[PDB]
Symmetry: C3
Subunit: 139 residues, 3 copies
Amino acid sequence: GSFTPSGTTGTTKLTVTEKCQVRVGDLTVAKTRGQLTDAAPIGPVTVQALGCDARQVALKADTDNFEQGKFFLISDNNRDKLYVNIRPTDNSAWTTDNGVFYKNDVGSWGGIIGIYVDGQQTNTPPGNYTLTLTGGYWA
Amino acid sequence: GSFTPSGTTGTTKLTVTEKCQVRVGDLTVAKTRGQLTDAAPIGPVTVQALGCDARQVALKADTDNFEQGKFFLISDNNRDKLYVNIRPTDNSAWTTDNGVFYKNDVGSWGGIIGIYVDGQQTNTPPGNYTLTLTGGYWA
Amino acid sequence: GSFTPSGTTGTTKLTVTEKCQVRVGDLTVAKTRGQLTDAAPIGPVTVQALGCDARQVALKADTDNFEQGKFFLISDNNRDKLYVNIRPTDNSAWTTDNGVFYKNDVGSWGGIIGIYVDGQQTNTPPGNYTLTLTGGYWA
Ligand SMILES: O=C(O)CCC(=O)OC[C@@H](NC(=O)C(Cl)Cl)[C@H](O)c1ccc([N+](=O)[O-])cc1
Ligand SMILES: O=C(O)CCC(=O)OC[C@@H](NC(=O)C(Cl)Cl)[C@H](O)c1ccc([N+](=O)[O-])cc1
Ligand SMILES: O=C(O)CCC(=O)OC[C@@H](NC(=O)C(Cl)Cl)[C@H](O)c1ccc([N+](=O)[O-])cc1
């Protein structure tokens, strides 16, 4: 049961605002707190594995993005959490183990991992939220 | 008289150089210190508000970018200032209040905010300068 | 013998992985440690000088990227080095002096600087490696 970092990093960012929302500069992913309903999509994460025919593809969340079997985006100040579910768009089987989301079967998997709001969190404080996922393999 | 953060962040960057200027890597906004003449344009900042029919759109500068009713880009080391004026390209009326630039009338305004050199500053030390503006609303 | 910073910054990034490599998110430059063979190209660095007819174009590496006449990409944690050679793709003559790579002749040079693995380093620890180069001039 261990993760070996071996791959690149994907960063999922979301800015939460109030109903009166002021977008400054280039387009980024932003939602009102009212839009943070259960199962609301936050964004996709592409995964492309190579040379993993005999290993289980895995993604490890940054330390600040997990606790107690749960994943969450975290505010810039490290204070506020936005709980999420992480799920492949296909029908593949994965397991969660202490910040690690790994594939049940070996193979050089390619696919999309979706990040979804876990439980309505319409009271989330406005701010910039991040989830960082690093590629590697589990055993 | 208070700002509520509610929106995204726009970052205005400028690299100041000497006459002999060496651009490394991708194109970025760069000027010689000799080009930092009064009213010289540094760049535009897009603003798009939504759901603000009953609020005054506002932009708040990072703490390190204002003092004494004045705005400035700040060097990477926090030491050197480049004083600027912030002005909408249209004929709309705005007010400055302690790092906050807010619109006089309520409404979901969309427009361009220009950043301009305030007073000739042709002796500015070469370096990378930044101005950070966060969207929200004032009352 | 001194460098005057005057220009922009180019950042060369490389993620080193094991054979089982998991790419997460957008495409970035990544190699297996087995690919870090001698003279292996890491990437190009564009250089465009202006107003340097009477100066020697120069690039200075960040402090953490050089020591003892040698250049290296450095890991995120500052611990691990990946030694490189820096060489213009054309036939121009340059000199290295304590973290500074400068052109022997004056002139507003434009060209490509290649970054290459210096000596096989197939045991490099997986991680994210960076080399930062700032433009300016030498005398
Ligand atoms: O994406 C966001 O920024 C917010 C969520 C969204 O787009 O709503 C719905 C959306 N789904 C997702 O973002 C899920 Cl989280 Cl993967 C959409 O159906 C979609 C986008 C991208 C891809 N893809 O690249 O394969 C598949 C499906
Ligand atoms: O922009 C820079 O990088 C330097 C300033 C400049 O472009 O000089 C002149 C320029 N103006 C500005 O940058 C002002 Cl600061 Cl908005 C130009 O007229 C312009 C650019 C973009 C837009 N727009 O997007 O609507 C309107 C006008
Ligand atoms: O580049 C990488 O990401 C890895 C190295 C590579 O591309 O292998 C080979 C490659 N060379 C380089 O990257 C050297 Cl380090 Cl400049 C290629 O021949 C090339 C790329 C770009 C340019 N250019 O912009 O002028 C010239 C030549």
